[PDB]
Each structure stands twice: as structure tokens, then as C-alpha cells.
């Protein structure tokens, strides 16, 4: 058994302190070990991001514009959690695909069946005006060209919407499939527990101050670094059993999930952080129907 004692898990890309030459045969290995693992991955990252904004006083009163939200099954959980906490938020879920019917019938959540383009962003900006916007993007086109086009749309989302904060889907293209350098918004590169086994995807979290928008250039050399750091994390780290972690499940992803969940606010009061987390996790798995 692959055991280890760990202090804390890697929360951000910048924390990864080692690399491994990516082995292409990894792409054939089992990508998921849990049912609805994708909704779980998304729920944890978004609970983490949104709890932070609450902590900074920027959540209440905002309109969350989630683009690429369908099916969005897990979003029902997110909405319920903050709604029950007394936070006032309007949700605007936009996707050309249809949403899970559990999202219907909520006065605070608007479902839009539209694929967004720059022009549409302008009209909804005019319509949301003057509410404060929090953007969440999870749009999916694959190719490096598909990715670049996605990233380009995400930047137009921020420029037209001009949100107070954003969570963007972010996976650096493969260095060996490089087309050209580009810019992404500056922000924290949040690592994702329960991402597929060999996924190099993270979520870019940003809070906008003043009227400045800071971007950062990404080059092929950066692409090689992302690939190796993420491969090391996936191959080595995520395969660990954290024995000094006294919790029902000691696998790395549960240790990692624990650290994101401990930052979440609950109405119920708990004697220990471990009790709150077990509760949130049980609650989350029950909601998603994960045994």
C-alpha cells in the first residue's frame, strides 16, 4: 500500500514542488473511480471559490453568471447552501444545452438556453445593469485551437461583463501541440480533488479591484512545466494514502477535499473541523447519489 504522512495537500498549482516526464500511456488508465465524479469535482471547486467571496463580503447582492452551466445538477446544491445561509444571490445559468429540471421553479435562478457570443454578452450586461456580477465559466468546445478559442471567449466574458470576481476553467494546451502564446487573467490556480486521474485542469480564481485587468502570458515553456507538475501530482501524489489523516477515507483526494471543505460556512455548529467536514461531505455525497 502506498502510504505517507502529509501536513497539508497541494491547494494551488504554485505549490507543486516536483515534476515527472509525462507518460502518454497514462491517457489509457482509468479516469474515474466514483459515480458522478464530475459533478463532485465542480461542486467542491465552486463551493471553495464562492465561500472565499463571502469571506471578502462580495457575494451577497451579486448576480452569479454561470456560462457553460448545463446540466448543472451540482449547482442545485450550491444554490441551496448559500440560500439557506441567508446570502442573497441571483443565479443566471446560460448554456445552449438544457439544465437538470431540479433547477426549475426557483425565483432566484434564471435558466437561459443560449450559446453566448460577444454580442449577447453586451445585451445581458445592459440587462443586468447595475448589479455586481460574479462570473463562473465552464464552457467546453479538445484541440489546442478549441482551447485557445475558449480562453479567448472567457477573456471577452470578463471585459464585457466586468465582474467583481471570476472562476474560469483552465487547462494549459500540450507543449507538443503548441499554436501560439496567449494571455489568461491573473488569478489563483486552484487544484481540483476528484478531477480525472490524469487531468491537468484547474480553475482560475480572480477578484477584480479598481478598473484594471491584469493578464499573464502563457508560453510553450509554461506548457511543458504545467504538464510535468500536473503529471507528478497525478501519478505520484494523488495515489497516496495519507495515514496520518484520521478520517474515514485516507486517499489523497479526500485529504485534499477536507481542506477545501473546512473553509465552508455552515449554520449548524460543530465541536471540531473534522465533524463539519464529515457532515458537509456526507451531505454532498448524499445529494449527488455517491455511495
Chain-centroid distance of CA 33 in Å reads 19
Which positions are annotated as active-site residues? 169
Annotated ligand binding at 66? The verdict is: yes
* Residue closer to a second copy, measured from CB, 215 or 266: 215
The distance of closest approach from Cβ of residue 181 to a second copy in the complex, given in angstroms and rounded to an integer, is 8
Which own/partner pairs from 246-252 qualify as long-range (CB within 8 Å, at least 24 positions apart)?
246/274, 247/274, 247/277, 247/278, 248/278, 252/9
The site string for ligand SAH over 49-68 (x = CB under 6 A, - otherwise) reads ------------------xx
Q: What b/e readout covers 137-162, taking b as 16+ CB neighbours within 10 angstroms?
A: bbbeeeebeebeebbebbbebbebbe
Q: Hunting for cell 489568461 — which residue is that?
A: 184
Check binding of 44 to ligand SAH (CB under 6 A). no
Check binding of 45 to ligand SAH (CB under 6 A). no
Check binding of 71 to ligand SAH (CB under 6 A). yes
The site string for ligand SAH over 93-132 (x = CB under 6 A, - otherwise) reads -xxxx-----------------xx----------------
What 3 state SS string does 111-153 have? EEECCCCHHHHHHHHHHHCCCCEEEEECCCCCCHHHHHHHHHH
Distance CA(257)–CA(34), nearest Å, equals 14
Task: List binding-site positions.
Answer: 22, 39, 66, 68, 72, 95, 97, 116, 138, 171-174, 176, 199-201, 227
Residues that bind a second copy (CB under 8 A): 122, 159, 162, 180-181, 183, 186, 211-217, 219
Residues that bind ligand SAH (CB under 6 A): 42, 67-72, 74-75, 94-97, 115-116, 138-140
Amino acid at each position: 500500500m502506498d502510504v505517507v504522512s502529509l501536513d497539508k495537500p497541494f491547494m494551488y498549482f504554485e505549490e507543486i514542488d516536483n515534476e515527472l516526464d509525462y507518460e502518454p500511456e497514462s491517457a489509457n488508465e482509468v479516469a474515474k473511480k466514483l459515480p458522478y465524479q464530475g459533478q463532485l469535482k465542480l461542486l467542491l471547486g465552486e463551493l471553495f471559490f464562492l465561500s472565499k467571496l463571502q469571506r471578502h463580503g462580495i457575494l451577497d447582492g451579486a448576480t452569479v453568471v454561470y456560462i457553460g452551466s448545463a446540466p448543472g445538477t451540482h449547482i442545485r446544491y450550491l444554490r441551496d447552501h448559500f440560500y439557506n445561509l441567508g446570502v442573497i444571490i441571483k443565479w443566471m445559468l446560460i448554456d445552449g444545452r438544457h439544465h437538470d429540471p431540479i433547477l426549475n421553479g426557483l425565483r432566484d435562478v434564471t435558466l437561459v438556453t443560449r450559446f453566448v457570443d460577444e454580442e449577447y454578452l453586451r445585451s445581458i450586461k445592459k440587462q443586468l445593469h447595475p448589479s455586481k456580477i460574479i462570473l463562473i465559466s465552464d464552457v467546453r468546445s479538445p484541440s489546442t485551437a478549441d482551447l485557445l478559442s475558449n480562453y479567448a471567449l472567457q477573456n471577452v466574458m470578463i471585459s464585457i461583463l466586468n465582474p467583481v470576481a471570476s472562476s474560469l476553467k483552465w487547462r494549459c494546451p500540450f507543449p507538443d501541440q503548441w499554436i501560439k502564446d496567449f494571455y489568461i487573467p491573473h488569478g489563483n490556480k486552484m487544484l481540483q480533488p476528484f478531477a480525472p486521474s490524469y487531468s491537468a485542469e484547474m480553475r482560475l480564481l480572480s477578484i477584480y479591484t479598481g478598473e484594471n485587468m491584469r493578464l499573464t502570458r502563457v508560453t510553450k515553456s509554461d506548457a511543458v512545466n504545467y504538464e510535468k507538475k500536473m503529471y507528478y501530482l497525478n501519478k505520484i501524489v494523488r495515489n497516496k494514502v495519507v495515514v496520518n489523516f484520521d478520517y474515514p477515507n485516507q486517499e489523497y483526494d479526500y485529504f485534499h477535499m477536507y481542506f477545501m471543505l473546512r473553509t465552508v460556512y455552515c449554520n449548524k455548529t460543530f465541536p471540531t473541523t473534522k465533524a463539519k467536514v464529515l457532515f458537509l461531505q456526507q451531505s454532498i455525497f448524499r445529494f449527488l447519489n455517491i455511495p
